[PDB]
Structure formats: C-alpha cells, structure tokens
Amino acid sequence: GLGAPRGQAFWPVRGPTLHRYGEQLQGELRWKGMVIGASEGTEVKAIADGRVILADWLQGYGLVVVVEHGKGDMSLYGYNQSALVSVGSQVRAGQPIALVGSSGGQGRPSLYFEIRRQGQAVNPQPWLGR
Ligand SMILES: [Cl-]
C-alpha cells in the first residue's frame, strides 16, 4: 500500500499542475485525477513499489499504465507516448514506467494521473513529496 497520505511518494513528473482533482472538466462534471504539464518524452516515475497491471489504450486517457501497490492502493498514468514496462512486471519507487506524450489528444504534452484507494480515484496530491 501507499500508507497514510504523508508526502512520501515520488512525484510522477515535475511540471505545472494544469488540472486538479475535483476541478471542472466540462460543465459541472469534475476531473477525477490531476494533469501535470511536462515536455514530450519526459520520464514518468512509478510513485511507489508495485506491480504493473495495465499498459494499453483506454479511451479518454490515451495510453495508460496502471501500477497496483497492494492493500487496495493503485496509481494510473495516462496520455503517454509510450510505456517502458509490461503488464505483470514488478517496479520500484521512482523507476521510469512511461514517457510523457499527447496520446489523450491534448493541446500540449502532459501526464494524466490518478491514485485510487479501495478502488476509487481520490485526490492524489497529499501522497506526493519526493
Ligand atoms: Cl484517448
């Protein structure tokens, strides 16, 4: 698991936060993840140790990689131009898992980022610090 939300996980990429969890997506619909701007090709880091469980297109989120951390915690990384890991692999905190792209069809390169606890996307920011 990711443990208490204490700023101990790695930021997946560093850049300006373009959209925050819960912010307006379209009308009164809300984002259920963050969007962090970064140059095309920047490495995306696994935030914590885990198992890669998905590495495929998911409509609305371009190419997504999903890492399970155990005990009901997961992290999701979308809009990537490519994945650097395959489903089934174990990854380490900080390890490169994808490269930033525009596969979500966005206006500029950026990472789509979710943390799901007990199967539900929640604000990821409080875990991020390293
Ligand atoms: Cl898409």
PDB file of C-alpha atoms and ligand atoms in Angstrom:
ATOM      1  CA  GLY A   1       0.000   0.000   0.000  1.00  0.00           C
ATOM      2  CA  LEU A   2       0.738   3.700  -0.184  1.00  0.00           C
ATOM      3  CA  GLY A   3       0.239   4.168   3.571  1.00  0.00           C
ATOM      4  CA  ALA A   4      -1.044   7.421   5.122  1.00  0.00           C
ATOM      5  CA  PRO A   5      -1.077  10.447   2.737  1.00  0.00           C
ATOM      6  CA  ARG A   6       2.166  11.951   4.075  1.00  0.00           C
ATOM      7  CA  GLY A   7       4.138  13.297   1.116  1.00  0.00           C
ATOM      8  CA  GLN A   8       6.411  10.228   0.937  1.00  0.00           C
ATOM      9  CA  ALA A   9       5.699   9.028  -2.622  1.00  0.00           C
ATOM     10  CA  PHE A  10       7.585  10.197  -5.697  1.00  0.00           C
ATOM     11  CA  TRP A  11       6.043  12.872  -7.939  1.00  0.00           C
ATOM     12  CA  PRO A  12       5.457  11.013 -11.225  1.00  0.00           C
ATOM     13  CA  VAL A  13       6.664  14.033 -13.248  1.00  0.00           C
ATOM     14  CA  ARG A  14       7.547  17.650 -12.346  1.00  0.00           C
ATOM     15  CA  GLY A  15       5.681  20.473 -14.001  1.00  0.00           C
ATOM     16  CA  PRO A  16       2.819  22.931 -13.660  1.00  0.00           C
ATOM     17  CA  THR A  17      -0.445  21.384 -12.416  1.00  0.00           C
ATOM     18  CA  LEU A  18      -2.831  22.006 -15.351  1.00  0.00           C
ATOM     19  CA  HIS A  19      -5.957  20.405 -13.742  1.00  0.00           C
ATOM     20  CA  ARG A  20      -6.639  19.401 -10.158  1.00  0.00           C
ATOM     21  CA  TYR A  21      -8.718  16.522  -8.856  1.00  0.00           C
ATOM     22  CA  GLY A  22     -12.332  17.643  -8.462  1.00  0.00           C
ATOM     23  CA  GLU A  23     -11.904  20.725 -10.716  1.00  0.00           C
ATOM     24  CA  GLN A  24     -14.336  21.426 -13.574  1.00  0.00           C
ATOM     25  CA  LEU A  25     -13.806  19.068 -16.522  1.00  0.00           C
ATOM     26  CA  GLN A  26     -16.777  20.020 -18.722  1.00  0.00           C
ATOM     27  CA  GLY A  27     -19.775  21.874 -17.229  1.00  0.00           C
ATOM     28  CA  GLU A  28     -20.287  20.560 -13.693  1.00  0.00           C
ATOM     29  CA  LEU A  29     -18.549  17.260 -14.439  1.00  0.00           C
ATOM     30  CA  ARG A  30     -15.285  17.029 -12.484  1.00  0.00           C
ATOM     31  CA  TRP A  31     -11.772  15.690 -13.082  1.00  0.00           C
ATOM     32  CA  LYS A  32     -11.039  12.540 -11.101  1.00  0.00           C
ATOM     33  CA  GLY A  33      -7.291  12.875 -11.469  1.00  0.00           C
ATOM     34  CA  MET A  34      -4.599  15.537 -11.952  1.00  0.00           C
ATOM     35  CA  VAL A  35      -2.931  16.743 -15.154  1.00  0.00           C
ATOM     36  CA  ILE A  36       0.713  17.735 -14.892  1.00  0.00           C
ATOM     37  CA  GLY A  37       2.367  19.531 -17.821  1.00  0.00           C
ATOM     38  CA  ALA A  38       5.818  18.326 -18.994  1.00  0.00           C
ATOM     39  CA  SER A  39       7.861  18.124 -22.189  1.00  0.00           C
ATOM     40  CA  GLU A  40       7.201  15.385 -24.648  1.00  0.00           C
ATOM     41  CA  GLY A  41       9.455  12.462 -23.833  1.00  0.00           C
ATOM     42  CA  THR A  42       9.990  13.200 -20.140  1.00  0.00           C
ATOM     43  CA  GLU A  43      10.245  10.107 -17.964  1.00  0.00           C
ATOM     44  CA  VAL A  44       7.187   9.222 -15.875  1.00  0.00           C
ATOM     45  CA  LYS A  45       8.116   7.665 -12.492  1.00  0.00           C
ATOM     46  CA  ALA A  46       6.300   4.945 -10.563  1.00  0.00           C
ATOM     47  CA  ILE A  47       5.299   6.736  -7.344  1.00  0.00           C
ATOM     48  CA  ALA A  48       5.895   3.697  -5.152  1.00  0.00           C
ATOM     49  CA  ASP A  49       6.768  -0.025  -5.428  1.00  0.00           C
ATOM     50  CA  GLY A  50       4.139  -2.096  -7.160  1.00  0.00           C
ATOM     51  CA  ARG A  51       3.018  -4.438  -9.935  1.00  0.00           C
ATOM     52  CA  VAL A  52       2.177  -3.257 -13.437  1.00  0.00           C
ATOM     53  CA  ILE A  53      -1.405  -4.415 -14.209  1.00  0.00           C
ATOM     54  CA  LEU A  54      -2.363  -2.449 -17.331  1.00  0.00           C
ATOM     55  CA  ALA A  55      -0.369  -0.948 -20.225  1.00  0.00           C
ATOM     56  CA  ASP A  56      -2.836  -0.156 -23.004  1.00  0.00           C
ATOM     57  CA  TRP A  57      -5.003   2.435 -24.639  1.00  0.00           C
ATOM     58  CA  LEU A  58      -8.051   3.448 -22.635  1.00  0.00           C
ATOM     59  CA  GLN A  59     -10.399   5.816 -24.447  1.00  0.00           C
ATOM     60  CA  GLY A  60     -10.273   9.301 -22.937  1.00  0.00           C
ATOM     61  CA  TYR A  61      -6.875   8.718 -21.324  1.00  0.00           C
ATOM     62  CA  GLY A  62      -4.619   7.784 -24.260  1.00  0.00           C
ATOM     63  CA  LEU A  63      -2.022   5.162 -23.435  1.00  0.00           C
ATOM     64  CA  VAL A  64      -2.349   4.269 -19.741  1.00  0.00           C
ATOM     65  CA  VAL A  65      -0.055   2.373 -17.406  1.00  0.00           C
ATOM     66  CA  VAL A  66      -1.538   1.158 -14.105  1.00  0.00           C
ATOM     67  CA  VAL A  67       0.541   0.096 -11.052  1.00  0.00           C
ATOM     68  CA  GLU A  68      -1.024  -1.730  -8.058  1.00  0.00           C
ATOM     69  CA  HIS A  69       0.687  -1.075  -4.733  1.00  0.00           C
ATOM     70  CA  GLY A  70      -1.133  -3.649  -2.608  1.00  0.00           C
ATOM     71  CA  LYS A  71      -3.701  -3.401   0.147  1.00  0.00           C
ATOM     72  CA  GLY A  72      -6.158  -1.693  -2.199  1.00  0.00           C
ATOM     73  CA  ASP A  73      -3.992   1.222  -3.474  1.00  0.00           C
ATOM     74  CA  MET A  74      -3.305   1.854  -7.202  1.00  0.00           C
ATOM     75  CA  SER A  75      -1.835   4.603  -9.389  1.00  0.00           C
ATOM     76  CA  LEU A  76      -2.683   5.382 -13.036  1.00  0.00           C
ATOM     77  CA  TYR A  77      -0.539   7.212 -15.615  1.00  0.00           C
ATOM     78  CA  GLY A  78      -2.144   8.364 -18.918  1.00  0.00           C
ATOM     79  CA  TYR A  79      -1.652  10.421 -22.116  1.00  0.00           C
ATOM     80  CA  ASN A  80       1.752   8.729 -22.576  1.00  0.00           C
ATOM     81  CA  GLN A  81       3.562   8.475 -25.911  1.00  0.00           C
ATOM     82  CA  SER A  82       4.954   5.025 -24.909  1.00  0.00           C
ATOM     83  CA  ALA A  83       5.277   2.589 -21.989  1.00  0.00           C
ATOM     84  CA  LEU A  84       8.653   1.433 -20.579  1.00  0.00           C
ATOM     85  CA  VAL A  85       7.209  -1.548 -18.695  1.00  0.00           C
ATOM     86  CA  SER A  86       4.981  -4.549 -19.468  1.00  0.00           C
ATOM     87  CA  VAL A  87       1.978  -5.941 -17.620  1.00  0.00           C
ATOM     88  CA  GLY A  88       2.990  -8.375 -14.885  1.00  0.00           C
ATOM     89  CA  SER A  89       6.275  -6.703 -14.003  1.00  0.00           C
ATOM     90  CA  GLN A  90       7.359  -5.546 -10.562  1.00  0.00           C
ATOM     91  CA  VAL A  91       8.513  -1.912 -10.421  1.00  0.00           C
ATOM     92  CA  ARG A  92      10.334   0.157  -7.835  1.00  0.00           C
ATOM     93  CA  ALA A  93       9.502   3.568  -6.398  1.00  0.00           C
ATOM     94  CA  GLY A  94      11.000   6.188  -8.735  1.00  0.00           C
ATOM     95  CA  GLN A  95      11.529   3.811 -11.635  1.00  0.00           C
ATOM     96  CA  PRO A  96      10.692   5.029 -15.183  1.00  0.00           C
ATOM     97  CA  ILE A  97       7.470   3.426 -16.425  1.00  0.00           C
ATOM     98  CA  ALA A  98       6.377   5.612 -19.375  1.00  0.00           C
ATOM     99  CA  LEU A  99       7.289   8.690 -21.446  1.00  0.00           C
ATOM    100  CA  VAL A 100       5.100  11.838 -21.471  1.00  0.00           C
ATOM    101  CA  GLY A 101       3.062  12.381 -24.639  1.00  0.00           C
ATOM    102  CA  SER A 102      -0.163  13.747 -26.089  1.00  0.00           C
ATOM    103  CA  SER A 103      -1.967  10.431 -26.648  1.00  0.00           C
ATOM    104  CA  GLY A 104      -5.078  11.743 -24.966  1.00  0.00           C
ATOM    105  CA  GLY A 105      -5.257  14.225 -27.857  1.00  0.00           C
ATOM    106  CA  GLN A 106      -4.445  17.120 -25.583  1.00  0.00           C
ATOM    107  CA  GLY A 107      -3.251  20.574 -26.698  1.00  0.00           C
ATOM    108  CA  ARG A 108       0.176  20.201 -25.063  1.00  0.00           C
ATOM    109  CA  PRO A 109       2.173  17.266 -23.651  1.00  0.00           C
ATOM    110  CA  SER A 110       1.220  16.278 -20.077  1.00  0.00           C
ATOM    111  CA  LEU A 111       0.665  13.369 -17.700  1.00  0.00           C
ATOM    112  CA  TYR A 112      -2.835  12.312 -16.614  1.00  0.00           C
ATOM    113  CA  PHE A 113      -2.527  10.985 -13.054  1.00  0.00           C
ATOM    114  CA  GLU A 114      -4.847   9.143 -10.668  1.00  0.00           C
ATOM    115  CA  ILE A 115      -4.491   7.479  -7.304  1.00  0.00           C
ATOM    116  CA  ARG A 116      -7.257   5.021  -6.436  1.00  0.00           C
ATOM    117  CA  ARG A 117      -7.730   3.858  -2.824  1.00  0.00           C
ATOM    118  CA  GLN A 118     -10.107   0.984  -2.239  1.00  0.00           C
ATOM    119  CA  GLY A 119     -10.959   1.124  -5.958  1.00  0.00           C
ATOM    120  CA  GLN A 120     -11.948   4.816  -6.098  1.00  0.00           C
ATOM    121  CA  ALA A 121      -9.993   7.733  -7.563  1.00  0.00           C
ATOM    122  CA  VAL A 122      -9.237  10.315  -4.870  1.00  0.00           C
ATOM    123  CA  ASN A 123      -7.078  13.473  -4.772  1.00  0.00           C
ATOM    124  CA  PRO A 124      -3.525  12.173  -5.445  1.00  0.00           C
ATOM    125  CA  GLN A 125      -1.607  15.217  -4.243  1.00  0.00           C
ATOM    126  CA  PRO A 126      -1.299  14.513  -0.484  1.00  0.00           C
ATOM    127  CA  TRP A 127       0.864  11.389  -1.123  1.00  0.00           C
ATOM    128  CA  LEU A 128       3.349  13.293  -3.319  1.00  0.00           C
ATOM    129  CA  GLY A 129       6.585  14.735  -1.978  1.00  0.00           C
ATOM    130  CA  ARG A 130       9.762  13.073  -3.205  1.00  0.00           C
TER     131      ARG A 130
HETATM  132 CL    CL B   1      -7.917   8.970 -25.985  1.00  0.00          CL
END
